[PDB]
Write a protein that binds this ligand. Structure first.
Ligand SMILES: Nc1ncnc2c1ncn2[C@@H]1O[C@H](CSCC[C@H](N)C(=O)O)[C@@H](O)[C@H]1O
Length: 220
């Protein structure tokens, strides 16, 4: 069910050959490991969860890849160096305040070579629970509650549960600018004609009219 998401992130990333890559909020390492498979020179993954990093390391042992993992809170992260690429699939929606969203963007900037780039996948600020739930596409959004200047959502995968935050487009763009990224662009998920042809008609209507997801590319 992650086909669109994978396609969009690797579209944003482009050619990884010979690059150094920091995969933030890496989970068991899905994106970092695939980025290595596609030719990256070196991949480091970071996650706040000790359990997730324990699985990430077990996965790297099982296929013998050279990924290195760290247990760190990205918002409050010990410096790890500078990379050609920072990948952040489902990092920023875990920032629990606008202040912590802004700190995460500053950490990413400090982690980038001058010619590097951030590729991110996060919650679309324009998502509105009343316009259509996302359960049909893999994420059952259970509720939507005002949380300071943003919104908090409880959700679950179709049944592992989790909670995340939907900050406004203006707050994301201020965090980006104030962290020192001189260029950014929002990327619509890459729903393609083949996806439409292989699903019942109108299956993707809510995905198009009320997408939970968005891509984001930022450059110093
Ligand atoms: N402050 C923080 N710093 C680092 N990781 C965090 C974090 N808050 C949440 N996470 C991690 O973010 C992950 C979101 S799930 C995304 C996992 C992976 N990038 C993938 O797409 O497959 C979880 O594994 C969670 O432990």
């Amino acid at each position: 069910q992650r086909a669109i998401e994978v396609r969009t992130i690797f579209h944003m990333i482009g050619d990884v050959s010979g690059k150094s890559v920091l995969d933030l909020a890496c989970g068991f390492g899905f994106f970092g490991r695939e980025i290595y498979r596609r030719g990256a020179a070196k991949v480091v993954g970071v996650d706040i969860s000790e359990k997730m990093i324990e699985l990430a390391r077990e996965e790297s042992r099982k296929y013998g890849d050279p990924l290195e993992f760290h247990v760190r809170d990205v918002a409050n992260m010990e410096p790890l160096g500078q990379f050609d690429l920072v990948n952040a699939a489902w990092l920023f929606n875990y920032a629990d305040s606008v202040e912590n969203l802004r700190k995460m963007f500053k950490v990413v900037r400090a982690s980038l070579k001058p010619d590097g780039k951030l590729v991110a996948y996060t919650v679309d600020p324009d998502f509105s629970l009343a316009k259509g739930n996302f359960a049909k596409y893999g994420v059952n959004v259970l509720n939507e509650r005002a949380w300071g200047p943003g919104y908090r959502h409880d959700a679950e995968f179709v049944p592992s549960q989790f909670s995340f935050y939907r900050w406004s487009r203006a707050d994301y763009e201020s965090a980006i600018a104030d962290a020192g990224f001189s260029h950014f662009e929002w990327q619509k998920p890459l729903l393609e004609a083949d996806d439409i042809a292989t699903h019942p008609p109108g299956f993707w209507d809510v995905f198009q009219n009320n997408c939970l997801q968005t891509g984001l590319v930022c450059k110093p």
